[PDB]
Amino acid sequence: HLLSLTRRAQKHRLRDLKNQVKTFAEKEEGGDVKSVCLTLFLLALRAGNEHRQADELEAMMQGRGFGLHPAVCLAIRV
DNA sequence: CTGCAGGGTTTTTGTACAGCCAGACAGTGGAGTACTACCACTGTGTAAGACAGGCCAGATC
Secondary structure (H helix, E strand, O other): OOOOOOOOHHHHHHHHHHHHHHHHHHHOOHHHOOOHHHHHHHHHHHHHOHHHHHHHHHHHOOOOOOOHHHHHHHHHOO
């Protein structure tokens, strides 16, 4: 399987689709491969009704808050 | 049928020029921020000690 292998064999196996995404992203988005594979990951996770992992991902990619503002904290407290 | 070994065969795996930058190491001067135990206060449960009164023994009615 692809998930247990090292990065050498993973990239060796996937280089075809890696350069496919490379050329398609330089075609459409103008030098943005990272956001292209991000939108691909989001669509592949939402098609399977696993919205939770997509929400965690979006909370990692410039996520609003690791920690909370003291205000809403006091709110929850009371 | 079986076990075993040259090579295949595809995958995996590390070593390989070659340049780049994230991430860390020291320390400074002490703030300071997070933590941990007082602390003032009574509500709730607890169980030792009153105790009384009921009962038997002493002695009586």
